[PDB]
Amino acid sequence: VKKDEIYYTILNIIQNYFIEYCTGKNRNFHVEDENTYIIVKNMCDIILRDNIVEFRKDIDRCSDIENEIPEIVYDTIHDKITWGRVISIIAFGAYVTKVFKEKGRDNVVDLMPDIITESLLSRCRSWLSDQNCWDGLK
Amino acid sequence: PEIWIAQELRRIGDEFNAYYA
């Protein structure tokens, strides 16, 4: 809930990956931490490339998906938090953002980064802090 | 529905995690 350095340390990377994934424009020179961005950018691009089809099916199966993001995140890492699950959330979050973008109206797209970062931190802050945020992912 | 998504993000997250240290 609280917007700290941690909240924005994560948001900066998610916000720019969503931007890059939706527009196809390079964001390596807008992010604060360039090395993390490349790693996370590639991690999510692998998950998407291998699971975009499943995402397409699960997404058409779910009406009213914007207000269900916090529940999906909650139900993904409530028993345990791992970087694999955290990355999968970001990747699936990226796909949804593009999907709502191609559906055409942006007001939701402007919120997806904060929505998942909020849901992510609502349960994983101490876990993220105890690894110095993205340092644990290297 | 929303629970199926969650469980597939866990399969994806767990397999992704095992194959990369």
Author numbering:
A (entry chain A): 5 to 142
B (entry chain B): 54 to 74
Provide the authors' own sentences about this structure as they appear in the paper.
In addition, the host intrinsic apoptosis pathway can be downregulated by viruses through the expression of B-cell lymphoma 2 (Bcl-2) mimics (vBcl-2), which nullify the activity of host cell apoptosis inducing Bcl-2 family members. Canarypox CNP058 is a vBcl-2 protein discovered amongst certain avipoxviruses. Our findings demonstrate that CNP058 is a Bcl-2 protein that potently inhibits apoptosis, is able to interact with the BH3 domain of pro-death Bcl-2 proteins, and provide a platform to understand apoptosis inhibition by CNP058. We showed that CNP058 binds to BH3 domains of pro-death proteins including Bak and Bax and most of the BH3-only proteins, and is able to protect HeLa cells against UV induced apoptosis. These findings establish CNP058 as a viral Bcl-2 protein with a broad pro-apoptotic Bcl-2 binding profile that is a potent inhibitor of apoptosis.
